Write a protein that binds this ligand. Structure first.
Ligand SMILES: Cc1cc2nc3c(=O)[nH]c(=O)nc-3n(C[C@H](O)[C@H](O)[C@H](O)COP(=O)(O)OP(=O)(O)OC[C@H]3O[C@@H](n4cnc5c(N)ncnc54)[C@H](O)[C@@H]3O)c2cc1C
Ligand SMILES: Cc1cc2nc3c(=O)[nH]c(=O)nc-3n(C[C@H](O)[C@H](O)[C@H](O)COP(=O)(O)OP(=O)(O)OC[C@H]3O[C@@H](n4cnc5c(N)ncnc54)[C@H](O)[C@@H]3O)c2cc1C
Lengths: 105, 105
């Protein structure tokens, strides 16, 4: 439970930062890459029950790849779906883009 | 700024090594291809421009080993050490790479 949670926190941090650095105006190939990436991300997540649940979640909520804004909002919303499932607080997605600076800007 | 980049990197590696350690001991051909495709996208989408370019070149030089989670995890330790080497950081002992990142699942 301890390790599972630590892996989870690290993964979300990476996840949200990745989406926040996606282009504002991606090319068709970049959109496809993000789409393919998310599918594999869900399938390979290092937790059986987590992966099963996430695969089902992205089927209901396909990643929005048209822009950095859409992608980041999508990420916050899907993370909140997991929060709902786990009886955790619902995160305010209002400043999602600013919450995950890459330190690369 | 610099702290952000470090925090994102630490989280990313934690996720990365745990994902590899959770890969099957005996993957199917399709699972091996999924990991191969995933790593390529992981490198291309990393949230830091210079880092992404550097890593893309690294995985081209050191292709991901997908025959088993043992081979994949060892490959992960080796490639992370190449980044350590480039950044003049200490080299991590890979002897217990699987146990180091148990999924706690
Ligand atoms: C893809 C994925 C699927 C998972 N599925 C499950 C599951 O099915 N079952 C299970 O037990 N565990 C699951 N986990 C684990 C779980 O989501 C948690 O990571 C873990 O329980 C630790 O919770 P936490 O309370 O520390 O915060 P986390 O949920 O790990 O949050 C990290 C932090 O990010 C912020 N945050 C919270 N919500 C959001 C949001 N909506 N958008 C942006 N930032 C947010 C907060 O600052 C918070 O402290 C999964 C993790 C991932 C990464
Ligand atoms: C794909 C990727 C590419 C990156 N490229 C660059 C880059 O080009 N330039 C730049 O400035 N930054 C880059 N970074 C960031 C950098 O690698 C570090 O994450 C960061 O500098 C913080 O370093 P750290 O000393 O805290 O430990 P990190 O290197 O983040 O290590 C995390 C921890 O994992 C363990 N660890 C160390 N080595 C290994 C290993 N070989 N195998 C398994 N576990 C290990 C240790 O317990 C350590 O504390 C990248 C990160 C990723 C994830």
């Amino acid at each position: 439970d301890k390790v599972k949670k630590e892996v989870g926190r690290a993964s979300w941090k990476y996840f949200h930062t990745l989406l926040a650095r996606f282009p504002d105006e991606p090319t068709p190939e970049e959109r496809e890459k993000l789409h393919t990436f998310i599918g594999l991300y869900a399938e390979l997540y290092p937790c059986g029950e987590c992966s099963y649940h996430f695969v089902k979640l992205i089927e209901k909520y396909p990643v929005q790849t048209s822009s950095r804004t859409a992608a980041a909002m999508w990420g916050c919303h899907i993370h909140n779906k997991v929060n709902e499932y786990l009886k955790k607080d619902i995160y305010d997605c209002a400043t999602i883009l600013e919450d995950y600076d890459c330190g690369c800007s």
